[PDB]
Structures are given as C-alpha cells and as structure tokens.
Design a protein around this nucleic acid. Sequence first.
DNA 1: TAATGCGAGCGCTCGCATTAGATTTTG
Lengths: 774, 1122, 90
Amino acid sequence: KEVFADYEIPYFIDGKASMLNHPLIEFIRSSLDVLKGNWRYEAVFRCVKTELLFPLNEPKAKVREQVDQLENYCIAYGIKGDRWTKTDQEIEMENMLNDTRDWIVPPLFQLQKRMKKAKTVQEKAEALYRYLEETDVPLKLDQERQRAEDDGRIIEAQQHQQAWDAVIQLLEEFVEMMGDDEISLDLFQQMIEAGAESLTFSLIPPALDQVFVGNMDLSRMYGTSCTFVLGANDGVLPARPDENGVLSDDDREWLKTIGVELSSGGRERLLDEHFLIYMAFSSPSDRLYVSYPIADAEGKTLLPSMIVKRLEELFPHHKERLLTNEPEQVSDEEQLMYVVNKSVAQSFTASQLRLWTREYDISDVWWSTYNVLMSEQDRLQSKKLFSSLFFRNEVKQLERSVSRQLYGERIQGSVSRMETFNACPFSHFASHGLHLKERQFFKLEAPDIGQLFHSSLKLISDRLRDEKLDWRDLTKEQCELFSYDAVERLAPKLQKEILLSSNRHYYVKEKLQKIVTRVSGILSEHAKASGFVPIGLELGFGGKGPLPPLTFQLKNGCTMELVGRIDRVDKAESSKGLLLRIVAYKSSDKGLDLAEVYYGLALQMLTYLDLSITHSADWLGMRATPAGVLYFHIHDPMIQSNLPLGLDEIEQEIFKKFKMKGLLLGDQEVVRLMDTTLQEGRSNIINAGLKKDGSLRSDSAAVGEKEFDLLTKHVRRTFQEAGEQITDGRVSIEPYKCAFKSVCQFDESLEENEYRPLKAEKDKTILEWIKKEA
Amino acid sequence: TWTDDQWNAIVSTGQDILVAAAAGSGKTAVLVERMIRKITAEENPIDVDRLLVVTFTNASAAEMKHRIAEALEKELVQRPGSLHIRRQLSLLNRASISTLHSFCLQVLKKYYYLIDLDPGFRIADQTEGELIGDEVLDELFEDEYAKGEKAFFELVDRYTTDRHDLDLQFLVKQVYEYSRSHPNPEAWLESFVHLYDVSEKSAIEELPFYQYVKEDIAMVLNGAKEKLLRALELTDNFLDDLAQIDELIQHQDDFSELYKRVPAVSDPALLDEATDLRNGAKKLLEKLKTDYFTRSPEQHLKSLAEMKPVIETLVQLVISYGKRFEAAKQEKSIIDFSDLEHYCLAILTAENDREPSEAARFYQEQFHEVLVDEYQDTNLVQESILQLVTSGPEETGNLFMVGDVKQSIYRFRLAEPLLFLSKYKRFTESGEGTGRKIDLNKNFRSRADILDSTNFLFKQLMGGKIGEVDYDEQAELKLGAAYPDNDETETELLLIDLETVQFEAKAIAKEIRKLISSPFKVYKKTHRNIQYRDIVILLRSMPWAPQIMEELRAQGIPVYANLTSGYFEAVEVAVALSVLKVIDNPYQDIPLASVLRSPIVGADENELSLIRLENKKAPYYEAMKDYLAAGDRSDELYQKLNTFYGHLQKWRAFSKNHSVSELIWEVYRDTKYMDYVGGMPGGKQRQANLRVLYDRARQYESTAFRGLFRFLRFIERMQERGDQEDVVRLMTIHSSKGLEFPVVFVAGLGRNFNMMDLNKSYLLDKELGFGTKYIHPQLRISYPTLPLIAMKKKMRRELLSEELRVLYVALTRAKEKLFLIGSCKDHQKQLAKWQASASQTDWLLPEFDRYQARTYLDFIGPALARHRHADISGHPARFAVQMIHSYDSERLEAIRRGEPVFAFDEKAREQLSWTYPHQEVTQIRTKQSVSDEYSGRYRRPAFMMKKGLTAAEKGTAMHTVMQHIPLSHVPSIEEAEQTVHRLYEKELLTEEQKDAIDIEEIVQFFHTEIGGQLIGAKWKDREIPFSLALPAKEIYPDAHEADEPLLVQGIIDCLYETEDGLYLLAYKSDRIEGGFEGAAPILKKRYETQIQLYTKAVEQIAKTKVKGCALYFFDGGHILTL
Amino acid sequence: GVQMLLRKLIEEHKQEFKVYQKASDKSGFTAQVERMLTEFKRYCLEPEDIRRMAESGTASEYRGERVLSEKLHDLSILYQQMEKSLADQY
DNA sequence: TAATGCGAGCGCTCGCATTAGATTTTG
C-alpha cells in the first residue's frame, strides 16, 4: 500500500481490513479500560482523543488545545482513579481544567454506574450502547464522514457508518446467545475485545484498471499478462506445514485408515503446494517474475526456496536480476527506471548527489534528472531538498534588535545561568532566551530532593533558636526527634504531595528522615569542633534581599544585575582579624575542581565568597580575609572495612565520611579554627593536616590569599566576557569535552560541528594560567 | 575423499557421539553426508522425518536443507527409478531441521492442552516482555511497601541505595533471569538459603564454596614463592621471606591456621628489578591477608549466618515476582523465549508420585537420531530437553552432538560448555560400552602460518583453570589446505605506544593500503588483489567502531560496521520522535523547537526568538500560533510556520483513524525528511535508522499496547535502559563465527578486559548460588562475605577462560593473513614484564601470571617473547613485529542555487512528464449494483428497538409476496393469505413481515388493467437478474476520457410477453397517499433512470425490444406507464 | 456468534471433558473448536458421527488412539450441545 | 580497584587519604 502509493500504481487487494484502528472501535475499547483499570489517565485520554467525547458544536481546534493541556496536567500530577470522580493566570487555566474534565468525566462516569450495576449480558450490552448514543457517536461520526469526502476520500468515509453496523451487530449476537446469562466486565470485556479483533471492513470493490495483488492459494485470475511471485524464500514458498487446529496430522492420517475422510491439513497440503506453485507459474501469458528478499524485516538472513533451484534446473542459463534501492549498483539502463515519478526521482537523485561528492562516478541519468527538476514550478521545493547536500547544522548569530527585546533591558544574571552559557551558548538561548519547558512528570527527580534537605535544615535552625538551643547542645536523641518533625511539616507540601501518592514514597519519607537525622548529629559534632560561627544564613544576594545586587558594566549598553543564594557564611575571629568562609550543602561527593572553574562551569562558591569578603567591610564594619569555600555532603554513608570494628570505631568512620571538600586558606591558624580538635595529623572535618612543626601538609587543599583573589578576579572577568557575548546575541553551539540536545541537533560527523576540548589540570597548572591572564 | 575422523563421525552408530570439530573442520559437510547415508542407502533406508536436527539459526538449518537436497537429486540421477529417494525430496519441508526454539514451538502447539497454555499464544519480543516485567514488578513492590512486613524493609534498606529504591528491582530481575537457566528454577531459588545456613561450629574447609578459596590460596602462595625464588637466583633477606612462605605453604590446607600465621608473620637493572619481585610477595601476600584473614574464620561464619533471614526474604520475593510475571503473560496469552523452553520441558516431563511423559515417548519413537550443532553453547534446560527426546541411555542411544569448547564464547548468556567437556572426558575415542568421541583436527580452510601461529600461542596460554581445557595434540589444528607456498603471510604485531584509538586506527589503515597498492594477491583457483572486502578488522567491543570507521574512510574506501545503539542519540531519530511527540501533544516546548529548527521547517535562531516575542508567558506552541494569526502572509517565517501548522493538524487527524506506522510513513512523505536525510553525510545509515523507527512501530502494533502515546513511552523505555560493495568490514569478534576473511586485523589488544561484573555487593552463580556482602543498615557497615570473595575468584578465572576463547575464534577466522594491533605506554618495560613470565619451560605459561592477565596483550606478549626452549622458539610460526613510537567545484555552486549545464537528457524529461492514458478509469468500480462484495451502488440494536417493522422492511416483505403469487389466475383475498402463510411456513418471511402485509394492496394489482394483462400472457418470468456492460461515461459524465465498459447489475421485477409485445413490470412500496395525480410526475423521475437501464439491459442483451413499462404502487394500488 | 455460544457451552459442560478440561479455560480454545465444527459440517459429519468415531478408539490400546478418542469425545459433547441450541431456530 | 603522594618511624618501611583511569560480548 505504501510503496505503490508513492509509485502511483493503482491496485486491488484480496484481503479485508481490520477495524482496530478505527476511532469507534478505539473509543469503545478504551472506555471499558477506563472503568476496568480504575481510571488510568492514559486510557481516559485514549477515549477523549477519539474525540467522540468532545462537546457538541464547540470548535474542535480549541478543544484539542484544552485536552492536550489537561493531559499535561494529569501527567505531572499523576491524576488517576477517584481523583476524577471527586488570579489572572490561575483562573484562565483552572477555569479550563474544570470545564474540560466537566464534559469528560460525566459521560464516562455515568457509564461505570450502569455497567458495574448490571448483572447480565443484555443490560451491560445496553449500558454500553447508551454510552455511545448519549455522546452522539452517530452524529459526530456522520460529520467526520463528510470531511473525508470533501478531502477526496470516500473509501475512508464509507468505513465510518460501516463501523457502526459492525459494533451494533456484535452486540445483537452477544445478547442473542448469552443475552440473559449473568456476567461481569472481566469476561464481558474480553469477549468484546475478541469481537473487535474479528471485526472487518467491506472488501474494496475492484476497479476497471488495476494491478491485482492477491495470494497464491485461493486467489483467482484471468487473462493475466505479467505475473510477479513474491516471497520465494525458504520455509515460506513451500509453506512449512502449519501447526494448528484440534487434530494433529497423525490424528487425521490415522482417521483416514478408519474410513473417515477429513480436511487434508497436514502433510497432504505440502504435496499440494507444488500444484499451487504450478498454477501460479503458469498464470501469466507474457512474462513471469519470481523474486525473493535476501534480508529480513529486522535483518536476519533469508534463503531462496527449493523452487528457485528447481527453476535454475529448467533454465540453467537464465541470469537473475538484482532489485536494489542503490541505483549505482546497476547499469545506466536500469538506472533510468527509477525516474518513474517526481517524488521518487527526487528521493533518489538527492541520494546520488550525496554519493557523488564522495568521489564516486555517478550515472548521468541523474544529472539529466536534476536539470529537469530545476526547470519547473516547484524548483524551490526540490532546491530545499537538495540543500541537504551541504547541510552543516549552522547557527546564525542573534541580531541586535532581537537580543535586546529577547533578553531585554537589564540582563538579570544568575550564577547558574552564567554556568549554563559557559557550558554551551545555545543551551542558554534555549532556556533563558526561548523559555522552553520540559513536560513535568509525577516522578521525584534528584534535584528537587536537595530542596527538601535545605528547607529541613533551615527549619531545624528555627526550632533550635526557639528553644534557645544550638547544634552543639543537641543529643543523639533530639537529633532524631527534631529531624523527623521537620520532614513531617514539609513532606506533604513537596512535589505535588508525591511523597503521599504511593507507599514506596512514604518509605522514602523515613529514608529522607534517617538521612537528616545523621546529618543533624554531624553538624553538632562539627560545631563542637569548629570555631567558625554562622554569620548569615540563606543570605538574600541580589534582587530583593539582604544584600545589593552585584552589577556589571560592559561596553555597548551592557547592564548585568545578577542575583543569587548564599547557603551559609560563617565568621571566626583570628589574630589576623575577621575571617569569613562559605558553606554550601550538596548531595555530590566533591565540591571544587579548579580546572572546572577556569572554563566557568563552577562559579558558585568563588562568587559567593567575593561578595562576603567585599561587603564584609561596609556590612558589619570590618575587613575580612577568605578562610575558604566548603561543600557539605548530605547523605547517610555506608562504610566498607576489612577490619572488624566496634561501635566506637564505626562512629569514627561514619564521621570521617562527612569530611568537607573544597578550597581552604594555607595557614596554621585558619586550619585550627575550622577544626579545633586537630593538633597533629589529619583532620576529619576539613581536608588539611599538620606536621609536627606546626606547618600544614602538602596534601592540604589550602592556598594563599593571593591565589584566592586570583581565582576571584578570574571569575569576575568570566561574568564580563561571557556577559557581553550574550548581549552581542551569541547562540553558538559548542559543547565541552542536555535537555535541549534534541533542539541542538549536534552532529559530529557533520562538519564545522566540534567538541571544544577541556583539559584535566593539576590545580597549579591553571592556577598558573590565570596568573598569566593579566 | 574424507578423513578417518570425518569417516568415523559419518558412519559411526550404536551410541551417543560427541564430535569435537575444530574451526574449518568441514563439520557441516560431514553432518550432511551422515544423514544422506541413513536416508538414501541400499540396505535399510529411513525417512527424513525420522530425524531431529537442531541448528543455532534457521538460516543454517535452511542451508542444511539445501545441501541435503543437492545430494538427493545427485543420488536420484544415479538411481533414476528410486521411489524412496524422490519421496525424501518431498519430506525436506516437513522434516525437523531448526533451532531448538523452533522445535519447542512445534511441541507447544501440538501438546498445549497438557499444560495451561492458550493455543494461538503469542511470543513477546525481549522488549515488551521486559516492559511487562517492570510493570508487574512495580505492582509487587508497591504491595510489599504497603504490607509493611518487617523482613521486607530489612531487605530494601539493605540493597537499595536509599533515597532511591531502584537498585532492588534490578536484583530481583537479575536473580529471576538467572534461575530461568535451570531446569527447575524455583528449587534452585530455594537452594539459595542452604549456603547461608551455618554455625560457628561449622567446617569451612568442608562446605562447597571453599573449593575456590583453597585453589586461590594455592596459586597466590605458590606464585609468591616462584616469584621469590628467582630473586634468589639473581643473587639473605629473600630466605627469611621464603622460609616464612614455605611455612605458609605447609598449612595451605588449614584455613584457621592461616588466620594465625598469614596476618601476623607476613647491575642497577637486575638489582632494582629484584626488589620488585620482592614487592610482588608483599603485594600478593597482602591481598591474600585482606581477602580472607582480616577477620576470624568464626567471625566470617557469624557474618554469614546473620544474612540468612535476608536471603530468605529476597528469595521469596523473586518467587512472588515470577508468579505475578507468569500470570500477566497468561492474561495476554503471552510467553517468553524462556517460557518456550520451560513450557516444552513441562510437556516432555509428566511427573507424579520424574517421568518422560507420553509426549516425550512420542518424540523418542519418531526420532531415530538427534543431531545438535554448536553443542558447547547448550544450556541446562535445553540439555534436559535433548535428553528427553533422545531415546536410550548414554551407553546406547541416538544423541549426536558437534562443537568445540575452545570456540565457546557465550557464557554471559549462561551457556555451560562444562556440559560438553564433561562428556568429552567421560567418552572414549573408541565406542566400548560408552559414548564415542571423535576429533576433527584438519583445517581445510586456512593457511599454514595461521594454524601455526594460533597453535603456538594457545599452547602456552590455554590450559588448566585459565583454559579449562588441556591444549594438546588431537586438539591442535592441523594443515589440510593446499595453499600455494607464498610469503608475506607472516603474522604481524604492531605495538603502538582518547587518541589511543586514533594511533591504532591509523596504523591499521596504513598496512591496509600497503596491501592495496602492493599486490598481495589472495588465492585450483586464481590469485587476485585485495578488494577491501576481503580484509576485516575485528574488535572485541564497539566503543571504538565509530571512531575507527571515520578516518579509515578519511582516506580511501569507506568502512562498514554493523552498529547497534547510539541510535537514540542519532539526530534523525531525535527529530523524528520530536515530530511524533508534537502530533501527540503540541504543548511541549522542547520537542516543538526541535522540529522548527530541523531542516523540516528550518526556522532561524532569530526566527525562533522572533516567535517567542509574540507571547512570552504562554507555551512555545501558543507563541507560534499567535505569530500566525496576526502575522502577514508575504512573510517568509510565516510561510514556514503556516505550512507546518497545516501539516500538524493533518497529522493530528490522520493518527486518530490510522496506525502509528502509517502516521510515520505519511510524515516521511509529507516532510520528505527521509529523502532529505539521504542527501547528507552518512545518509545511507540515517535513512535506515529512520526506517527502523517505522519497522519498530510495526513490531509495536503486534504488541499488547496500542496508540501513539504508549508507543512513545515504549520507545522511551528502550531509551532509558537498553536501547555487494567492497569495504573494510568492522565487526565484533563475537559476531565473527563461521565467517572468515583472507586478511584479519585484531586490534584493541592493549586494552583492559571488562571485569565490571566483579564489583557490586552481590553475585549470581550456577553452582554456589547467591552471594553478597554483609550489610548492616543500622550500624551503616558492610564488607565482603567469604562466599562472595570465593565467587569472584572463580568468576574471574571463568571470565578469563572465555576471553582466551574469544581470542581463539578471532585468529581462526583468518584464511591467509593475520594482523595484531595492541597499545601501551612504555614499550621496553612491558617486554621486561613479558620476559619475567616467559622463563618457565613446559610450554604452558605460569598458571598465576596468566591469571593476572588484564589486557589481551598480556596473553600474546609473553607467549610471543620466547618465540624469537628448543621446540618453542623452533616452532614453525612466522611473526613480524613493529615497535611504533605512535607519534610518526562549479556543479556544487550551481546545485547550491540553480542547475548545472547529458546522454539521458531527453528520456528523463519524457518520463517525468508521462501520464497514464487510461488513468481516468483506474478509480472507477467495475461492478455497480442497482437495487456481493465486488460491486458498488444509525441502526439501533434489535433488543433496544421497536417491536415492529420499518417502511423498508415492510416493502421488502410486500415485494416477496408479489413474486411468489401464482400467476395462473386472479387470486382472492384468501388465496393471497394462503400464499403469505406458505411463505411463512417455508421461512421466506419473518413472523413480523407476515403480520405487516396488507393483502388488499397485494390483490389490488391483479384487478388492474396491467394485472389482468400479466395473468393472460404467452410467457412470463419474475426476479430476473441481469448484467449490462456500458461505456464508463454513460453513467459517469464526469470522466469522459475513457470508453472502457463497466457492469451495471440489477433485478427486473417482472417481464411478460403478449401478442402485442414484451412489457416490463416493477412494484414500488413508495409513499404516496397522505391526490396521486401530483405524485406521478415525481415518482416518474425517481425511477426514471432505473427503468431505462432495464429496457436497455433487455433490448441490448436480448436483442428484442421493450414496449411499455409499468410501475405498481402499494399505496392506493396505483399504476403509471413509461 | 458461534464462539460466544461455544464459550457458554465450554463453561457448563466443561467438567465432562476427558482431555481438554484444562484447555477449556483459554479463550483461544473457543476459536479452535469453532473451526473444528465447521469442518465437521463441511465434511458431512454429524454429532452422532463423531460420537460414533469417539468410541471406536475407546478401549483399543494404542496411546494416541485413546487420546484422540478422548478429544473426539469432548468435541462430540460441544458439537451435539451446539446443534441442540441451534436446533430449528438458527 | 590499584595507585601515588605525603608523613613519619627507621634507601628502607606502614599507614592514611584522594586521584586517576579506564567500561562489553547478543550467534
């Protein structure tokens, strides 16, 4: 059907066509599913999208716009089962989401009432029909019938009211045989289900001039000139004895000898194959073509049948031709048989132009074909097609008028947004430029898990201050008591109450709890050791908050007001004066890779530090020096030891798992202020140590105040050089060594598309590179 | 002629036979010959149906059938009058030559009723099958979480990476899948606990798993000594270290003593290299200590006995899963490929209180002999199926099996070559009261240097626990090729030391052209150059395939590798799915943009952003419409969009009345995306990718799922989890098999094996069962359990034996030339490491150093060194080593816009302007009725409808009577009733129809002028069928072009002849009175055209003429003439 | 409609089956029987004829014959029970 | 997982801790 449609070859097929794809059949099937599987939203929309549930007289266009948005809503909120039966922007939306379900639920809901109600067949069969009629299936169908005719498809228009008759009769016989027998949906549906599978459309009546495509068994022909035989493969043509029915071939074979004759069915059929093959081979008067595919639908190997051999016996000198969609594999003659049609000509000629540029000598039949296609009306269309010849996925730079009205007046920066641009300029354009959104799902993603921990941590503090308590004053008892409550007060209000949706999630609850309980105890131990006391927490950085926005002035009207979030800033008094450090909670293992900072992929902490440092002056009235940047790993660790341990040593190992990674200051004091327990050797709280002399070890992640201001300034330049590029309207696609990847369409084989390499650098190497910048 | 070995295999009988057939053994030919004899022989011939031949592919089976044919006709020409031989030729189609699965199916279809299996059951592909698995799984877990059993959570908490529960259900699947490799899955699953049931009072050296601990300890300790002894030969400290070690060797048997000892006691060139051999001791002895002796034998015991409650919970879970899984399939009348073998085994075994059921008795009778190919890859279930259809105890019986353990490369699919190997040791070369075994050494297919190189390598590699098989004579390959003596056939090794693959792919490409430009002609045939298609580059994995392919195409011929996945990250695919997504739900910002930016639409980045400007808050979909509605028409961007929005709505409507595959094809033809994609780099593969998406949808409509939405998830699931031309064929070694090539490149040899399997907190093993770490969720502590470590020690040496065989199939797939390409960092030092290993005499390299093997290189290198200790170096094998430092126009521009400026210039233009002369008729129906499925021209359920008839049905009844009324005379009201009643009796009328007839209106006709004329007539006939052929336009004025005849078919109600002429008569139940004077004009032309067709039908066909036509009307009994 | 009827017959008369008692359950067994009856009518074999054949194999020891008769027996039940519900009115 | 570092204790040793570096095979 597909091939001949493209090659414009009129035909006639013996077999009939199933109705399983017809809206009426789908509408019915999915409707029973709706109430059987307890209103799975997938089934509901399966029904609604046969649009037989659609409201009357309301323009279908808008209806589909609403049905789709209702679907998206149900997918993200996991709407199922009972949930169905139970300002400016919000209204418009929610005033649609009610209307939509308001015409969807009742007809389908009132149906389950009548259905689950009725005991016998006829009444369940009746309830079904009334579901069809009250929804005006006939009317809406009849309408569709017209559209089909208006568009030149009467064959398709027939099958509509034709489908109706099939269903009705399906019920009539059903109620005729088992009408007053008692049955409920389980067997009832299954019978209707098998009823659908059996349903068939009327055979399409032959036309005056057609190619006859039929079978090799009971198909009949007359006056045929040319006959093509398909599928001359092994196990196919001399059809392997089919294994079906109630009686085996042994049973029948046996029965014969008792004086009872039945249908052949078994090994006789195989003997009869040669007669049918003989009748097929002698069918044409002029020409006979016998063909067999070498590969398979999926690509498994296929051999010719013994018939091809038997043929090569009677015609030992006959050469066999080769059918291929790769014209270059045949002579110029056959190559001229591909130009049967404009569409097919185009499809092939495009593929030839490709292969030609690959330094292959192509036939001139295609050049002739090219010039013809370029001489007619739709030259443009074929031109766009042939433009594929040289298609490098290329990105036109954003104009000035566009980026100005797109990104806007002020570019209100976000450290993350800058990371995003520095990860791939195009990704930025996709998210912040075009404001694209992913379909939301009822799944609880890893990212929004972290937001829970924060809001729990933030919540614990408030409880502590209320009792005038500090993390240090906590007991193992309270750590659990406090942590659990925090999730109780949060869990319900997180991610569409998904933590309340199922049972697995409410086990994820206590899980999220046990984790918080351990981290709570760790912070306590960390506070009884740390000399750093938290100054500010969840500090409003930029926009509307405690701090001012950090501003950026760059050539060509570049205004960048970037905003952000400072998890924690801690203060410690030293002989060197005031000390400030930042702490951010993470679920990951490591915190800072200097190599990753150079390319501007990790600007988070370093930028947070600067503000604290800079503003520290006019903020509290003192000048601060960077102690460093730290990442706290929130998790419930599992230790792995070959050494048998006592609960004493286990507590230790667990404790060390929370050792903070990051970037410190390289002096003895700062190290001893972050861990006052440490005298000599390794610290378990921070990544640093002390030799006997008092000097810290080389393994320390510490650096001088110089290197800190160096990294700081580098970051400043990164917000700048990357802040201008945005305004300059740069949307280039340059991934490193994504959700928008399907929009990127990045192809490495396709030239001009390159992976900009990132190198793995010993901290000092880049620490040296940034030195050379200025 | 044949070999004596082949002759043996061919003619031997009376017992089970195991044929170990080396590569190029010609096993296939001998297999054919064997059956040919039994089937076509003088003495006592047998029919083909009395044989059971199992192959590993239907293709090899099919190929089997062809040769059996070829030889049958040959034997038939020589015996022209043979009835039996001709019959056999007919039996090949009914014969049992297939895969075991293909047989199992034949069995299930025949004996389905013995188990509970729906006939017409459907075999689900591995994809949906697993989709159904995830489904039932989620259902089970949900039930358990909700059930709140204490034990369950202990299992969950323990094996889940908490904050996440995913890892647990994979374990369940993993375990379940494993159990299915056993003849009795559930039993084997309950076998799990038996290992974890111990006491501190238990003897470790006793229980099953320690077998591998014992052997491990042996190797390491000995490997330490033998590694120290040399240090002594190099020349007091080594003795203190050695004496201590010997001391440990004394107690190897005692694990408890080792716990006491092991933990506690434990030239600048030759000088500093002797300290390394001493560090070897430390390293080996230290790993030994950490593994087994960090915690007491008693502690290890308690650890294991504490895990029992968990193992039990886990087991019963997997069992509950299996039950639900099987149930889900049943509902949908579905089976797996696993089910296929197990349901076959169920049928063959009818056990009551193990009985080879009547079904099995049938096949034992039917099959005089059974032949199994590739036997080394048989599983336990298949084997128990084989032994079930084979008749007779091993000493006798008809089991015939061929294969080679050395060529067993599929253990990851749970095939057990030990089954083949256990029989080879149990069988004798003669057949004395036991299974007869036969060896096929002669390789008729390959050149000498290859066999010599392959034989020289594996002689030093394959053996003991790392080879699992003793490499010796009667195993070693032997020359049977007649290849003419030529050189440059020497096996090459190019040592090159992300860019790794680059330097390695270049090197390969080099010597390739070195073969091209230079002749190196490959060979009573004739020599010929390299066609590129005769050279193949074998990789063990395919991460490098795409990269290697590239530059090997950068210069010269292209490269064709059979890629598997990376399919979902393919741009074409991404875009195609993006389109299907928008057709499903236009409200998806990303998928929508994906299409708009693809060549399909081709919006600029500025054009895309220009769209958003219309509406910043609404979904990108609405922003698009908002641009359209208000936009201006002469706008280019508008044209791109309006065209697309047009297609969208079309596709939308199209999908609701069509299938997904149809919707896809239509989209391909509407966008010409598949055509377009064929015009860009790698467009050949792209087009295929794009049409496998179509085929996968085709596979998808035969599944238990339907609709576009499901299809998307279906494909989405595949994503989240699993997913003649002359050219260098790049493929995996595993895929080589019976394939072969004159020249072969085996690269990536300097790369690590994949041992990732040995990492996790658990392991599955056929023998030992389940093994896992000790895990305490409350203390947050875990550590490897003794069985776990034992299972890893074993699995490591079994994985290594598999790799050595993978390397064995690689070298044997070569005909003439062999290239080996490895890679490292420092050349010399590794050759020094290779030197260290190459010292020991006896051919077979040190069992421990081969154990430490990581890269293929570590197998070849040392085995190669000693070559170029008498026979070893003297062995007739040629090697060539190369140490590499690893460092050393107008037509387009015309096309770009317009057209270039040929022989076919004239033909092409005609064919593109060509139309079908008769095309106007190709849509017209041949048969057209006037009132059979070959012709053309709000129903309520009978149970919910009225109790009466409709005007139509009444008319039908009224009509029937008129045509059954006796025309002998004028009937009376009663004479009419009698007729009506008789029609009722004979069932020409329904009870309803009978009661609906107005007799007055039926008799009324026979009192009319026409009626009486009908009565009085020389001749009469009623219900006259006719077929009239008319020129097509005479009916369809629209199509005037063609004069082909069409058939109009109908039934003339009545015809009668008088002394005047022939008259036509039709009765019409038309609605009239409600005068008739005013209806006549209307009725006249309601039936006007119809009656003319009638008169025409009669006049033209009968060649007589119709004078006058009458129509009677039941309403008032009216008559009008035409 | 014949299969629908059959599924009703395969319900009640189920426990009289000597062989297909287990296969009666399955929905693919109704189509198989429906096809067998069609063949029985086309080849002029009445329920009485099948019953007749069913007891020709009963008690003559060739296993496969015994089984065959047992299935002919079950079919006979459904066959004769179908003709009995289709008698004179269908 | 080894595998280097980096400290000590005493050109050798242990022991602690972070880092690197690669990773599949489906007849």
